[PDB]
Ligand binder design. Sequence first.
Ligand SMILES: CCCCCCCCCCCCCCCCCC(=O)O
Lengths: 10, 244
Amino acid sequence: HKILHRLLQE
Amino acid sequence: TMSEIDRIAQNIIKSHLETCQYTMEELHQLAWQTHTYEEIKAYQSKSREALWQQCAIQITHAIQYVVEFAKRITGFMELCQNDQILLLKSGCLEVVLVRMCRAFNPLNNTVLFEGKYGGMQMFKALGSDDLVNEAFDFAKNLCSLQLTEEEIALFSSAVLISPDRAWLLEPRKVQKLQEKIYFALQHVIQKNHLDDETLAKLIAKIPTITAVCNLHGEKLQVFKQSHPDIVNTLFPPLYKELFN
Ligand SMILES: CCCCCCCCCCCCCCCCCC(=O)O
């Protein structure tokens, strides 16, 4: 879940 | 501790207000705007792939706001990132579905889509009236409860923070927070809904919410069969990541 992970880390 | 319940409630309520595409005010001013007969026809003249693409973009847009919603809920960010992902992956659409009721008009059974309100015939090209009808029925029934933004904020957070999702590593931790959320929701409901059954009627809707979202997944899987290239190269990457 790369994208979802990125958004949470923003 | 009542004080902890109140801090959790304020946090979630505030997150909700800062993470909706349209504030409640902006919606009151949009509910009078409705797609014309011409515009409705244009939507119906769309190819199934074209409209699916449009809907996937809108859903993804709404899902992104739910992520922002979750990120601002202190109790949610305290869970292990693994359970955070699991909760979001399994409930983002369910939260979107709940949030849709905010932009639904039960007077004429229309919903806000691409700037104006339109009926279910607007989605004819999707070739999934069963899904559209279940989505609209849900929204209509929820709207009948006349929830306030605080209640929608809290209830939507409870739908997202579910200790019952499969694969969760710390379900007890999730359960403890959901319990506090519901406790908060129960108190907030009293300020409005005299007598009620409200909290109970809301909780009884949990399975229906999941049912609608699973149907969405079902329709998408068949859509992928017929149009693989559209899903893999035209749908928002997050939408593909979450549902395919
Ligand atoms: C509300 C999400 C659950 C999936 C519904 C299945 C399809 C139903 C017809 C299409 C409705 C418009 C797209 C969904 C987005 C609704 C709300 C929003 O734009 O924030």
